[PDB]
Structures are given as C-alpha cells and as structure tokens.
Design an enzyme around this catalytic site. Sequence first.
Site, PDB file in Angstrom:
ATOM      1  N   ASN A   9      -9.153   5.063   2.717  1.00 43.52           N
ATOM      2  CA  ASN A   9     -10.110   5.970   1.683  1.00 43.52           C
ATOM      3  C   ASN A   9     -10.922   6.725   2.468  1.00 43.52           C
ATOM      4  O   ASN A   9     -11.871   6.333   3.259  1.00 43.52           O
ATOM      5  CB  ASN A   9     -10.482   4.860   0.389  1.00 43.52           C
ATOM      6  CG  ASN A   9     -11.708   4.303   0.913  1.00 43.52           C
ATOM      7  OD1 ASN A   9     -12.692   5.048   0.842  1.00 43.52           O
ATOM      8  ND2 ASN A   9     -11.541   2.988   1.145  1.00 43.52           N
TER       9      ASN A   9
ATOM     10  N   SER B  27     -12.028  10.253  -4.403  1.00 41.95           N
ATOM     11  CA  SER B  27     -11.619   9.855  -3.119  1.00 41.95           C
ATOM     12  C   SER B  27     -10.112   9.787  -3.183  1.00 41.95           C
ATOM     13  O   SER B  27      -9.607   9.950  -4.235  1.00 41.95           O
ATOM     14  CB  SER B  27     -12.172   8.650  -2.594  1.00 41.95           C
ATOM     15  OG  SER B  27     -11.835   7.421  -3.378  1.00 41.95           O
TER      16      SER B  27
ATOM     17  N   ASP C 290     -12.507   8.159  -8.572  1.00 43.20           N
ATOM     18  CA  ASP C 290     -13.769   8.690  -8.163  1.00 43.20           C
ATOM     19  C   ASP C 290     -13.594   9.827  -7.628  1.00 43.20           C
ATOM     20  O   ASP C 290     -14.602  10.438  -7.042  1.00 43.20           O
ATOM     21  CB  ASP C 290     -14.553   7.393  -7.259  1.00 43.20           C
ATOM     22  CG  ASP C 290     -14.004   7.313  -5.972  1.00 43.20           C
ATOM     23  OD1 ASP C 290     -12.961   7.808  -5.676  1.00 43.20           O
ATOM     24  OD2 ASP C 290     -14.617   6.675  -5.171  1.00 43.20           O
TER      25      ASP C 290
ATOM     26  N   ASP D  35      -6.661   7.997  -0.814  1.00 44.03           N
ATOM     27  CA  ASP D  35      -6.195   6.913   0.059  1.00 44.03           C
ATOM     28  C   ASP D  35      -4.989   7.507   0.700  1.00 44.03           C
ATOM     29  O   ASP D  35      -4.047   8.029   0.366  1.00 44.03           O
ATOM     30  CB  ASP D  35      -5.884   5.689  -0.792  1.00 44.03           C
ATOM     31  CG  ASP D  35      -6.631   4.896  -1.318  1.00 44.03           C
ATOM     32  OD1 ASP D  35      -7.821   5.277  -1.250  1.00 44.03           O
ATOM     33  OD2 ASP D  35      -6.075   4.220  -2.184  1.00 44.03           O
TER      34      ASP D  35
ATOM     35  N   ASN E 224      -7.901   8.515  -6.012  1.00 44.02           N
ATOM     36  CA  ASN E 224      -8.721   7.439  -7.055  1.00 44.02           C
ATOM     37  C   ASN E 224      -9.504   8.142  -7.902  1.00 44.02           C
ATOM     38  O   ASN E 224      -9.449   9.435  -7.931  1.00 44.02           O
ATOM     39  CB  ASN E 224      -9.684   6.800  -5.895  1.00 44.02           C
ATOM     40  CG  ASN E 224      -8.951   6.115  -4.756  1.00 44.02           C
ATOM     41  OD1 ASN E 224      -9.138   6.163  -3.643  1.00 44.02           O
ATOM     42  ND2 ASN E 224      -7.878   5.452  -5.213  1.00 44.02           N
TER      43      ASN E 224
ATOM     44  N   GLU F 238       0.815  -1.087   0.094  1.00 47.23           N
ATOM     45  CA  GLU F 238      -0.002   0.067   0.082  1.00 47.23           C
ATOM     46  C   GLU F 238       0.939   1.110   0.068  1.00 47.23           C
ATOM     47  O   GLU F 238       0.533   2.021  -0.917  1.00 47.23           O
ATOM     48  CB  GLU F 238      -0.906   0.098   1.184  1.00 47.23           C
ATOM     49  CG  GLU F 238      -1.964  -1.147   1.161  1.00 47.23           C
ATOM     50  CD  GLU F 238      -3.058  -0.888   0.098  1.00 47.23           C
ATOM     51  OE1 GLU F 238      -3.006  -0.021  -0.754  1.00 47.23           O
ATOM     52  OE2 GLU F 238      -3.846  -1.704  -0.066  1.00 47.23           O
TER      53      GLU F 238
END
Length: 129
Positions: free
Chosen positions: A59, A50, A48, A52, A46, A35
Amino acid sequence: KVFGRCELAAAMKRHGLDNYRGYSLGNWVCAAKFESNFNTQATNRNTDGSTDYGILQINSRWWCNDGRTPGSRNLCNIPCSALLSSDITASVNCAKKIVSDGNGMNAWVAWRNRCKGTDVQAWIRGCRL
Ligand code: NA
C-alpha cells in the site's frame, strides 16, 4: 505478468522470502494468491485513497510513492509502479521491510483472514524447489 503457483514459489525462494522472519514459503504464496491471484499488475484502491500494488498488494500509505496519497510515506524508497513489474525484486525487498515492522504477516489482512493457521504447505506441494 501472471505467475504460475510453483513459478512464483521459486522466484520468492530465490529472493530469500522462504522462512523470512520465520514465515515458510507457503505463507508467502498463499498471501500472493489471495492478494493478487499471482498477477504482478494487480491494483486496488482503498477507501482512504491509498492504493495497493502488485503480487502482495503493498500500500501507498506507508511503503511506496504514487504521488496521490496525501500524508503518506515511501518507506521502501520506490515508485509504487515498481511493484507491478514482471520482476518481483521490488515487491520482495519491500515485503521484507513490511514483515519486519512488528505485526509480521498480519500486515496483510488477507493473510490473517485466509492463510494464517491453514495448511499453507499445500501452496508449494509438488513444486520443484
Ligand atoms: Na506513499
């Protein structure tokens, strides 16, 4: 902060993540490696919109507030910035809520794709725990 592998395994163990929801410590260290490369300041946007955040790339769609993810929740009741701290307490506490959500560690797509079913004990090999 960039953790060392065994340094992060110790911090996660102290915060009770070792065998949390039945996931051995090497699972959590493996997920953090892929990660964030053990970097608390890791961020990823992301498609969309969003974002992380942190060692486990938690997220903003569900888990933290960053003020710029329309329609999102803050189920860990934290600013997403808390996930970037050199202190992993907020990341761990929020990871516990995520891994309790029904799909276990499949919530982390990198865990499913790169850790699940592998020899995850190798991630804590040689650590004094
Ligand atoms: Na949010």
